[PDB]
Protein backbone atom coordinates (compact mmCIF):
# COMPACT_ATOMS: atom_id res chain seq x y z
CA UNK A 1 0.00 0.00 0.00
CA UNK A 2 1.21 3.49 0.99
CA UNK A 3 4.27 2.24 2.92
CA UNK A 4 7.30 2.40 0.61
CA UNK A 5 10.84 2.04 1.93
CA UNK A 6 13.35 3.16 -0.71
CA UNK A 7 16.58 1.38 0.16
CA UNK A 8 19.68 2.71 -1.60
CA UNK A 9 23.23 1.80 -0.65
CA UNK A 10 23.63 2.10 3.10
CA UNK A 11 20.87 4.69 3.54
CA UNK A 12 17.18 3.82 3.39
CA UNK A 13 14.22 6.13 3.93
CA UNK A 14 10.68 5.29 4.97
CA UNK A 15 7.38 6.99 4.31
CA UNK A 16 3.88 6.00 5.38
CA UNK A 17 1.98 8.51 3.25
CA UNK A 18 3.57 7.76 -0.11
CA UNK A 19 1.72 9.08 -3.15
CA UNK A 20 4.08 7.32 -5.55
CA UNK A 21 7.38 8.01 -7.29
CA UNK A 22 6.67 10.56 -10.02
CA UNK A 23 9.05 9.27 -12.66
CA UNK A 24 9.71 12.05 -15.14
CA UNK A 25 9.66 11.84 -18.97
CA UNK A 26 10.47 8.09 -19.10
CA UNK A 27 9.50 4.81 -17.49
CA UNK A 28 12.88 4.24 -15.82
CA UNK A 29 15.05 7.37 -15.46
CA UNK A 30 17.85 5.25 -13.99
CA UNK A 31 18.76 3.76 -17.39
CA UNK A 32 21.37 6.05 -18.92
CA UNK A 33 24.12 5.35 -21.45
CA UNK A 34 27.62 6.90 -21.10
CA UNK A 35 28.37 10.35 -22.53
CA UNK A 36 29.21 10.49 -26.22
CA UNK A 37 31.40 13.59 -25.81
CA UNK A 38 34.30 11.88 -24.04
CA UNK A 39 37.12 9.66 -25.24
CA UNK A 40 38.01 8.26 -21.83
CA UNK A 41 36.34 5.89 -19.47
CA UNK A 42 33.77 7.42 -17.13
CA UNK A 43 33.64 6.90 -13.38
CA UNK A 44 30.27 5.19 -13.05
CA UNK A 45 28.23 4.67 -9.90
CA UNK A 46 29.72 2.90 -6.91
CA UNK A 47 28.25 1.94 -3.59
CA UNK A 48 29.46 5.00 -1.65
CA UNK A 49 27.52 7.56 -3.71
CA UNK A 50 24.47 5.37 -4.38
CA UNK A 51 22.68 6.74 -1.34
CA UNK A 52 20.42 9.50 -0.10
CA UNK A 53 21.60 12.85 1.25
CA UNK A 54 19.19 14.36 3.76
CA UNK A 55 19.61 18.09 4.25
CA UNK A 56 17.39 20.60 5.94
CA UNK A 57 15.52 23.53 4.49
CA UNK A 58 13.94 26.59 6.03
CA UNK A 59 10.80 26.39 8.14
CA UNK A 60 7.34 27.15 6.78
CA UNK A 61 5.59 29.72 8.94
CA UNK A 62 2.33 31.63 8.70
CA UNK A 63 4.32 34.70 7.62
CA UNK A 64 5.01 33.07 4.24
CA UNK A 65 2.72 34.39 1.52
CA UNK A 66 1.44 32.61 -1.57
CA UNK A 67 3.96 31.59 -4.29
CA UNK A 68 6.98 32.26 -2.05
CA UNK A 69 9.42 29.69 -3.33
CA UNK A 70 12.69 28.27 -2.04
CA UNK A 71 15.12 26.94 -4.61
CA UNK A 72 17.63 24.13 -4.07
CA UNK A 73 19.94 23.72 -7.08
CA UNK A 74 21.23 20.30 -8.05
CA UNK A 75 24.15 19.60 -7.89
CA UNK A 76 24.64 23.18 -6.71
CA UNK A 77 23.55 22.37 -3.15
CA UNK A 78 26.16 19.62 -2.73
CA UNK A 79 28.93 22.09 -3.50
CA UNK A 80 27.94 25.09 -1.40
CA UNK A 81 26.50 22.87 1.40
CA UNK A 82 23.04 24.42 1.25
CA UNK A 83 20.91 23.49 4.22
CA UNK A 84 23.51 21.37 5.99
CA UNK A 85 23.60 19.18 2.89
CA UNK A 86 27.09 17.74 2.94
CA UNK A 87 27.61 15.73 -0.20
CA UNK A 88 29.79 13.09 1.40
CA UNK A 89 31.81 11.07 -1.08
CA UNK A 90 29.76 12.45 -3.97
CA UNK A 91 31.09 15.97 -3.59
CA UNK A 92 34.52 14.46 -2.96
CA UNK A 93 34.17 12.99 -6.46
CA UNK A 94 32.34 15.93 -8.01
CA UNK A 95 35.21 18.32 -7.26
CA UNK A 96 37.70 15.97 -8.93
CA UNK A 97 35.87 15.36 -12.20
CA UNK A 98 35.39 17.94 -14.90
CA UNK A 99 32.16 16.70 -16.48
CA UNK A 100 29.28 15.06 -14.64
CA UNK A 101 26.15 13.48 -16.10
CA UNK A 102 23.58 12.25 -13.59
CA UNK A 103 19.84 12.19 -13.12
CA UNK A 104 18.39 12.95 -9.74
CA UNK A 105 15.80 11.42 -7.43
CA UNK A 106 14.55 13.74 -4.70
CA UNK A 107 12.08 13.48 -1.83
CA UNK A 108 10.81 16.39 0.26
CA UNK A 109 9.46 15.63 3.74
CA UNK A 110 7.16 17.93 5.69
CA UNK A 111 4.96 16.49 8.43
CA UNK A 112 1.68 18.36 8.83
CA UNK A 113 -0.86 17.32 11.43
CA UNK A 114 -4.46 16.80 10.31
CA UNK A 115 -5.39 20.16 11.89
CA UNK A 116 -3.01 22.19 9.72
CA UNK A 117 -3.80 23.35 6.22
CA UNK A 118 -1.45 24.21 3.40
CA UNK A 119 0.02 22.92 0.18
CA UNK A 120 3.64 23.11 -0.87
CA UNK A 121 4.31 22.68 -4.57
CA UNK A 122 7.49 20.63 -4.85
CA UNK A 123 8.80 20.44 -8.40
CA UNK A 124 12.05 19.61 -10.20
CA UNK A 125 12.29 22.77 -12.30
CA UNK A 126 14.87 22.50 -15.11
CA UNK A 127 17.39 25.16 -16.09
CA UNK A 128 16.73 28.07 -13.77
CA UNK A 129 18.89 30.67 -12.08
CA UNK A 130 16.72 31.09 -9.00
CA UNK A 131 19.57 30.75 -6.52
CA UNK A 132 21.35 33.74 -8.06
CA UNK A 133 20.76 37.28 -6.86
CA UNK A 134 19.54 39.79 -9.44
CA UNK A 135 23.18 40.93 -9.35
CA UNK A 136 25.02 37.88 -10.66
CA UNK A 137 26.69 36.41 -7.58
CA UNK A 138 25.13 33.27 -6.14
CA UNK A 139 23.50 33.39 -2.72
CA UNK A 140 25.66 32.38 0.23
CA UNK A 141 24.38 30.57 3.32
CA UNK A 142 23.81 33.86 5.14
CA UNK A 143 21.51 35.26 2.44
CA UNK A 144 19.44 32.07 2.54
CA UNK A 145 19.04 32.73 6.27
CA UNK A 146 18.38 36.47 5.91
CA UNK A 147 15.17 35.96 3.90
CA UNK A 148 14.19 32.28 4.59
CA UNK A 149 11.73 32.25 1.64
CA UNK A 150 12.02 34.16 -1.63
CA UNK A 151 8.91 36.18 -2.41
CA UNK A 152 7.45 35.83 -5.90
CA UNK A 153 7.76 39.49 -6.83
CA UNK A 154 7.30 40.99 -10.28
CA UNK A 155 11.03 40.67 -10.93
CA UNK A 156 10.73 36.88 -10.78
CA UNK A 157 7.50 36.72 -12.78
CA UNK A 158 8.95 38.78 -15.61
CA UNK A 159 12.46 37.41 -15.36
CA UNK A 160 13.71 40.96 -14.99
CA UNK A 161 16.33 40.10 -12.36
CA UNK A 162 18.26 37.27 -13.98
CA UNK A 163 22.03 37.89 -14.17
CA UNK A 164 23.38 40.02 -17.00
CA UNK A 165 26.70 41.22 -18.38
CA UNK A 166 27.99 44.73 -17.82
CA UNK A 167 27.82 46.39 -21.23
CA UNK A 168 30.40 48.96 -20.20
CA UNK A 169 30.59 52.70 -20.46
CA UNK A 170 30.26 52.68 -24.26
CA UNK A 171 26.70 51.44 -24.66
CA UNK A 172 23.84 53.34 -23.08
CA UNK A 173 22.44 50.80 -20.60
CA UNK A 174 19.07 49.61 -21.88
CA UNK A 175 15.96 49.34 -19.76
CA UNK A 176 15.90 45.59 -19.15
CA UNK A 177 12.33 44.35 -18.97
CA UNK A 178 12.37 40.60 -19.59
CA UNK A 179 14.59 37.54 -19.51
CA UNK A 180 13.81 33.94 -20.40
CA UNK A 181 14.60 32.41 -16.97
CA UNK A 182 11.41 33.83 -15.46
CA UNK A 183 9.02 31.89 -13.28
CA UNK A 184 5.42 31.90 -14.33
CA UNK A 185 4.18 30.87 -10.86
CA UNK A 186 0.85 29.59 -12.15
CA UNK A 187 2.52 27.17 -14.56
CA UNK A 188 4.98 25.41 -12.28
CA UNK A 189 2.82 22.29 -12.46
CA UNK A 190 4.07 21.58 -15.99
CA UNK A 191 7.30 20.46 -14.33
CA UNK A 192 7.70 17.02 -12.70
CA UNK A 193 5.87 17.85 -9.52
CA UNK A 194 3.81 16.60 -6.64
CA UNK A 195 1.75 18.71 -4.26
CA UNK A 196 2.58 18.28 -0.58
CA UNK A 197 -0.90 18.84 0.75
CA UNK A 198 -1.46 18.95 4.50
CA UNK A 199 -4.07 16.19 4.23
CA UNK A 200 -2.87 13.57 1.75
CA UNK A 201 0.84 13.08 2.23
CA UNK A 202 3.98 14.06 4.09
CA UNK A 203 6.53 13.12 1.42
CA UNK A 204 6.60 13.78 -2.32
CA UNK A 205 8.68 11.59 -4.62
CA UNK A 206 10.15 12.92 -7.88
CA UNK A 207 12.54 10.95 -10.09
CA UNK A 208 14.06 12.91 -12.95
CA UNK A 209 16.54 11.87 -15.65
CA UNK A 210 19.59 13.74 -16.91
CA UNK A 211 18.65 16.57 -19.22
CA UNK A 212 21.05 19.15 -20.54
CA UNK A 213 22.14 20.98 -23.67
CA UNK A 214 25.24 18.78 -24.06
CA UNK A 215 25.50 14.98 -23.57
CA UNK A 216 27.37 15.76 -20.36
CA UNK A 217 27.77 19.11 -18.65
CA UNK A 218 30.42 20.73 -16.50
CA UNK A 219 30.58 19.77 -12.85
CA UNK A 220 31.03 23.12 -11.16
CA UNK A 221 28.78 25.17 -13.40
CA UNK A 222 25.61 23.19 -14.03
CA UNK A 223 22.10 23.85 -12.77
CA UNK A 224 20.12 21.56 -15.05
CA UNK A 225 17.60 20.78 -12.32
CA UNK A 226 16.41 22.93 -9.44
CA UNK A 227 14.30 21.69 -6.57
CA UNK A 228 11.60 24.29 -6.06
CA UNK A 229 9.31 24.24 -3.03
CA UNK A 230 6.53 26.74 -3.70
CA UNK A 231 3.72 27.68 -1.33
CA UNK A 232 0.36 27.43 -3.08
CA UNK A 233 -1.81 27.70 0.04
CA UNK A 234 -0.34 29.39 3.15
CA UNK A 235 -0.05 27.52 6.41
CA UNK A 236 -2.87 28.10 8.85
CA UNK A 237 -3.62 26.66 12.28
CA UNK A 238 -5.22 27.55 15.59
CA UNK A 239 -3.16 28.65 18.57
CA UNK A 240 -1.78 25.53 20.21
CA UNK A 241 -0.79 23.43 17.22
CA UNK A 242 2.83 22.78 16.29
CA UNK A 243 4.04 26.07 14.88
CA UNK A 244 6.64 26.24 12.07
CA UNK A 245 6.89 22.70 10.68
CA UNK A 246 10.29 21.88 9.30
CA UNK A 247 10.94 20.97 5.68
CA UNK A 248 13.70 18.58 4.66
CA UNK A 249 14.72 17.05 1.36
CA UNK A 250 16.61 13.93 0.32
CA UNK A 251 18.57 13.90 -2.93
CA UNK A 252 19.98 10.75 -4.55
CA UNK A 253 21.86 10.85 -7.88
CA UNK A 254 20.75 7.97 -10.10
CA UNK A 255 23.45 6.60 -12.46
CA UNK A 256 26.12 9.32 -12.60
CA UNK A 257 28.93 9.41 -15.11
CA UNK A 258 31.99 11.35 -14.07
CA UNK A 259 34.38 12.17 -16.92
CA UNK A 260 37.60 14.11 -17.00
CA UNK A 261 39.49 13.44 -13.78
CA UNK A 262 41.70 16.17 -12.35
CA UNK A 263 42.79 17.48 -8.98
CA UNK A 264 40.42 19.04 -6.49
CA UNK A 265 38.89 22.24 -7.82
CA UNK A 266 40.81 25.37 -6.84
CA UNK A 267 39.24 28.64 -7.95
Amino acid sequence: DRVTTQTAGNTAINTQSSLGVLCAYVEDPTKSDPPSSSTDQPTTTFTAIDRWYTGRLNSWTKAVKTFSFQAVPLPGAFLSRQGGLNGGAFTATLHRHFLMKCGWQVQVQCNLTQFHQGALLVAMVPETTLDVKPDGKAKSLQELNEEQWVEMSDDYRTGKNMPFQSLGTYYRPPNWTWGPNFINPYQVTVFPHQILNARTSTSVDINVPYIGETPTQSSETQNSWTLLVMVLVPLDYKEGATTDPEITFSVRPTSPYFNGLRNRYTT
Binding site: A24, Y25, V26, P29, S32, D33, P35, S36, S37, T66, Q114, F115, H116, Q117, G118, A119, D154, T177, W178, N184, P185, Y186, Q187, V188, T189, V190, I195, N197, A198, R199, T200, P209, Y210, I211, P215, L232, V233, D236, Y237, K238, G240, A241
Partner: protein, 231 residues
Amino acid sequence: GPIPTAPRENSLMFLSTTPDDTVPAYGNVRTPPVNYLPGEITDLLQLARIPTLMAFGRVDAYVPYVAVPTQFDDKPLISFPITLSDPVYQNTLVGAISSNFANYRGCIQITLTFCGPMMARGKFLLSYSPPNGTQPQTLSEAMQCTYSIWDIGLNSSWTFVIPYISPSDYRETRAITNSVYSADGWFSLHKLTKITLPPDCPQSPCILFFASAGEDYTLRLPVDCNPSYVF
Protein backbone atom coordinates in the same frame (compact mmCIF):
# COMPACT_ATOMS: atom_id res chain seq x y z
CA GLY B 1 16.47 22.26 -75.32
CA PRO B 2 14.62 24.98 -73.43
CA ILE B 3 11.47 23.79 -71.67
CA PRO B 4 8.93 26.54 -72.41
CA THR B 5 7.53 27.62 -69.07
CA ALA B 6 5.10 30.36 -68.06
CA PRO B 7 5.69 31.87 -64.62
CA ARG B 8 2.57 32.84 -62.72
CA GLU B 9 1.44 36.16 -61.25
CA ASN B 10 2.96 35.27 -57.86
CA SER B 11 6.47 35.05 -59.26
CA LEU B 12 9.27 36.28 -56.97
CA MET B 13 6.78 36.61 -54.12
CA PHE B 14 8.05 35.91 -50.63
CA LEU B 15 5.20 34.29 -48.73
CA SER B 16 6.13 33.65 -45.12
CA THR B 17 4.33 30.32 -44.62
CA THR B 18 4.84 28.61 -47.97
CA PRO B 19 4.50 24.86 -47.29
CA ASP B 20 7.75 24.10 -49.08
CA ASP B 21 11.53 24.00 -48.71
CA THR B 22 14.23 26.31 -50.08
CA VAL B 23 17.79 26.08 -51.39
CA PRO B 24 20.47 24.86 -48.97
CA ALA B 25 23.57 26.86 -48.52
CA TYR B 26 26.05 25.10 -46.26
CA GLY B 27 24.94 21.50 -46.23
CA ASN B 28 26.45 18.12 -45.35
CA VAL B 29 26.54 19.01 -41.65
CA ARG B 30 26.24 16.04 -39.33
CA THR B 31 24.77 17.38 -36.16
CA PRO B 32 25.58 15.84 -32.77
CA PRO B 33 22.87 13.38 -31.79
CA VAL B 34 20.05 14.03 -29.36
CA ASN B 35 19.30 10.41 -28.55
CA TYR B 36 20.17 11.12 -24.92
CA LEU B 37 17.50 13.75 -24.28
CA PRO B 38 14.29 12.39 -22.75
CA GLY B 39 10.85 13.90 -22.90
CA GLU B 40 10.40 15.12 -26.46
CA ILE B 41 7.34 17.24 -27.10
CA THR B 42 5.97 15.64 -30.23
CA ASP B 43 2.84 17.79 -30.04
CA LEU B 44 1.91 20.89 -28.07
CA LEU B 45 -1.28 19.17 -26.88
CA GLN B 46 0.93 17.22 -24.51
CA LEU B 47 1.03 20.39 -22.43
CA ALA B 48 -2.52 21.68 -22.53
CA ARG B 49 -3.36 18.33 -20.95
CA ILE B 50 -1.01 19.10 -18.04
CA PRO B 51 -3.09 20.96 -15.43
CA THR B 52 -1.88 24.40 -14.45
CA LEU B 53 -3.14 26.92 -11.94
CA MET B 54 -5.76 29.59 -12.45
CA ALA B 55 -5.80 33.09 -10.98
CA PHE B 56 -8.69 34.60 -9.05
CA GLY B 57 -8.93 38.16 -7.84
CA ARG B 58 -8.76 38.19 -4.05
CA VAL B 59 -11.81 39.33 -2.01
CA ASP B 60 -1.09 42.26 -9.52
CA ALA B 61 -1.41 40.03 -6.42
CA TYR B 62 -3.82 37.32 -7.50
CA VAL B 63 -4.48 33.98 -5.88
CA PRO B 64 -4.79 30.47 -7.38
CA TYR B 65 -7.36 29.34 -4.77
CA VAL B 66 -10.81 30.27 -3.52
CA ALA B 67 -11.07 31.14 0.15
CA VAL B 68 -14.30 29.66 1.50
CA PRO B 69 -16.08 31.92 4.01
CA THR B 70 -18.26 30.59 6.79
CA GLN B 71 -21.12 32.96 5.91
CA PHE B 72 -24.16 31.60 4.10
CA ASP B 73 -25.05 33.20 0.78
CA ASP B 74 -27.04 31.87 -2.16
CA LYS B 75 -24.62 33.00 -4.85
CA PRO B 76 -21.70 31.01 -6.29
CA LEU B 77 -18.52 31.10 -4.29
CA ILE B 78 -16.55 31.72 -7.47
CA SER B 79 -17.87 32.09 -10.99
CA PHE B 80 -16.04 32.72 -14.20
CA PRO B 81 -17.05 32.56 -17.86
CA ILE B 82 -15.76 29.73 -20.01
CA THR B 83 -13.82 31.84 -22.48
CA LEU B 84 -10.14 31.29 -23.01
CA SER B 85 -9.44 35.02 -23.15
CA ASP B 86 -10.83 35.53 -19.64
CA PRO B 87 -8.19 36.62 -17.11
CA VAL B 88 -8.62 33.49 -14.99
CA TYR B 89 -7.17 31.72 -18.03
CA GLN B 90 -4.23 33.91 -19.07
CA ASN B 91 -1.56 31.97 -17.19
CA THR B 92 -2.80 28.45 -17.63
CA LEU B 93 -1.15 26.32 -20.26
CA VAL B 94 -4.58 25.81 -21.77
CA GLY B 95 -5.34 29.48 -22.10
CA ALA B 96 -1.85 30.60 -23.09
CA ILE B 97 -1.31 28.03 -25.81
CA SER B 98 -4.83 28.57 -27.15
CA SER B 99 -4.56 32.36 -27.12
CA ASN B 100 -1.77 31.89 -29.67
CA PHE B 101 -4.24 30.05 -31.92
CA ALA B 102 -7.56 31.05 -33.46
CA ASN B 103 -9.95 28.16 -32.86
CA TYR B 104 -10.37 25.37 -30.34
CA ARG B 105 -12.57 22.32 -29.98
CA GLY B 106 -13.17 20.04 -27.07
CA CYS B 107 -13.40 19.83 -23.34
CA ILE B 108 -11.75 22.12 -20.82
CA GLN B 109 -11.10 20.07 -17.68
CA ILE B 110 -11.30 22.05 -14.44
CA THR B 111 -9.55 20.13 -11.66
CA LEU B 112 -10.18 21.14 -8.07
CA THR B 113 -8.31 20.31 -4.88
CA PHE B 114 -9.52 20.89 -1.34
CA CYS B 115 -6.38 22.10 0.43
CA GLY B 116 -8.05 22.41 3.82
CA PRO B 117 -7.49 20.20 6.86
CA MET B 118 -8.12 16.48 6.74
CA MET B 119 -10.88 16.66 9.36
CA ALA B 120 -13.13 18.89 7.23
CA ARG B 121 -16.31 17.47 5.74
CA GLY B 122 -18.33 19.32 3.14
CA LYS B 123 -19.91 19.25 -0.28
CA PHE B 124 -19.65 21.55 -3.28
CA LEU B 125 -21.95 21.87 -6.27
CA LEU B 126 -20.16 22.54 -9.55
CA SER B 127 -22.43 23.94 -12.23
CA TYR B 128 -21.54 24.73 -15.82
CA SER B 129 -24.30 26.76 -17.34
CA PRO B 130 -24.55 27.11 -21.11
CA PRO B 131 -24.97 30.72 -22.33
CA ASN B 132 -28.21 32.10 -20.96
CA GLY B 133 -29.33 35.71 -21.00
CA THR B 134 -28.57 36.00 -17.28
CA GLN B 135 -25.76 34.42 -15.29
CA PRO B 136 -27.24 31.91 -12.82
CA GLN B 137 -26.58 32.87 -9.21
CA THR B 138 -29.12 30.97 -7.10
CA LEU B 139 -28.28 27.36 -6.25
CA SER B 140 -31.70 26.43 -7.63
CA GLU B 141 -30.87 28.17 -10.91
CA ALA B 142 -27.61 26.22 -11.07
CA MET B 143 -29.01 22.87 -9.95
CA GLN B 144 -30.80 22.78 -13.30
CA CYS B 145 -27.68 23.20 -15.46
CA THR B 146 -24.84 20.69 -15.91
CA TYR B 147 -23.71 20.18 -12.32
CA SER B 148 -21.94 17.60 -10.17
CA ILE B 149 -21.70 17.35 -6.38
CA TRP B 150 -18.22 16.92 -4.90
CA ASP B 151 -17.97 15.33 -1.45
CA ILE B 152 -14.80 16.10 0.48
CA GLY B 153 -13.28 12.90 1.85
CA LEU B 154 -10.15 10.82 1.57
CA ASN B 155 -9.41 11.58 -2.08
CA SER B 156 -9.07 15.32 -2.45
CA SER B 157 -9.55 16.24 -6.10
CA TRP B 158 -12.40 16.44 -8.56
CA THR B 159 -12.07 16.88 -12.31
CA PHE B 160 -15.22 18.55 -13.59
CA VAL B 161 -15.00 18.14 -17.37
CA ILE B 162 -16.78 21.03 -19.08
CA PRO B 163 -18.70 19.72 -22.10
CA TYR B 164 -18.27 21.14 -25.56
CA ILE B 165 -21.75 22.48 -26.18
CA SER B 166 -21.58 24.82 -29.16
CA PRO B 167 -23.24 25.03 -32.58
CA SER B 168 -20.03 25.63 -34.51
CA ASP B 169 -17.53 22.78 -34.58
CA TYR B 170 -14.64 25.04 -33.53
CA ARG B 171 -15.21 27.81 -31.03
CA GLU B 172 -13.34 31.07 -31.26
CA THR B 173 -10.55 31.06 -28.70
CA ARG B 174 -10.60 34.83 -28.18
CA ALA B 175 -13.87 36.61 -27.53
CA ILE B 176 -12.41 40.12 -27.74
CA THR B 177 -15.32 41.31 -29.89
CA ASN B 178 -18.38 43.56 -29.25
CA SER B 179 -19.43 41.69 -26.14
CA VAL B 180 -22.52 40.36 -24.38
CA TYR B 181 -23.14 37.82 -21.63
CA SER B 182 -20.44 35.58 -22.90
CA ALA B 183 -20.68 32.29 -24.63
CA ASP B 184 -19.64 29.71 -23.73
CA GLY B 185 -21.48 30.25 -20.47
CA TRP B 186 -20.32 30.17 -16.88
CA PHE B 187 -18.62 27.78 -14.52
CA SER B 188 -19.68 28.28 -10.91
CA LEU B 189 -18.60 26.65 -7.64
CA HIS B 190 -21.49 26.61 -5.16
CA LYS B 191 -21.04 25.40 -1.63
CA LEU B 192 -23.97 23.08 -1.03
CA THR B 193 -23.57 22.21 2.64
CA LYS B 194 -21.32 24.31 4.85
CA ILE B 195 -17.88 22.99 5.75
CA THR B 196 -18.19 21.54 9.25
CA LEU B 197 -14.82 21.75 11.02
CA PRO B 198 -14.07 20.30 14.47
CA PRO B 199 -12.86 22.69 17.20
CA ASP B 200 -9.30 24.05 16.92
CA CYS B 201 -9.23 23.86 13.11
CA PRO B 202 -8.66 26.89 10.85
CA GLN B 203 -11.69 28.70 9.54
CA SER B 204 -11.90 29.41 5.78
CA PRO B 205 -10.08 26.57 3.97
CA CYS B 206 -8.87 26.90 0.39
CA ILE B 207 -10.02 25.17 -2.81
CA LEU B 208 -7.05 25.22 -5.15
CA PHE B 209 -8.28 25.38 -8.77
CA PHE B 210 -6.58 23.90 -11.83
CA ALA B 211 -7.47 24.04 -15.53
CA SER B 212 -6.33 21.33 -17.92
CA ALA B 213 -7.53 20.18 -21.32
CA GLY B 214 -9.51 17.05 -22.07
CA GLU B 215 -8.52 14.02 -24.05
CA ASP B 216 -10.30 15.57 -27.04
CA TYR B 217 -9.15 19.20 -26.89
CA THR B 218 -7.97 20.24 -30.31
CA LEU B 219 -6.59 23.52 -31.63
CA ARG B 220 -6.54 25.04 -35.10
CA LEU B 221 -5.21 28.04 -37.09
CA PRO B 222 -2.09 29.69 -35.61
CA VAL B 223 -2.17 33.48 -35.37
CA ASP B 224 0.47 36.04 -34.48
CA CYS B 225 0.80 36.19 -30.72
CA ASN B 226 0.43 39.17 -28.44
CA PRO B 227 3.99 40.40 -27.76
CA SER B 228 2.89 42.26 -24.63
CA TYR B 229 4.61 39.81 -22.26
CA VAL B 230 7.87 41.66 -22.83
CA PHE B 231 6.94 45.27 -21.99
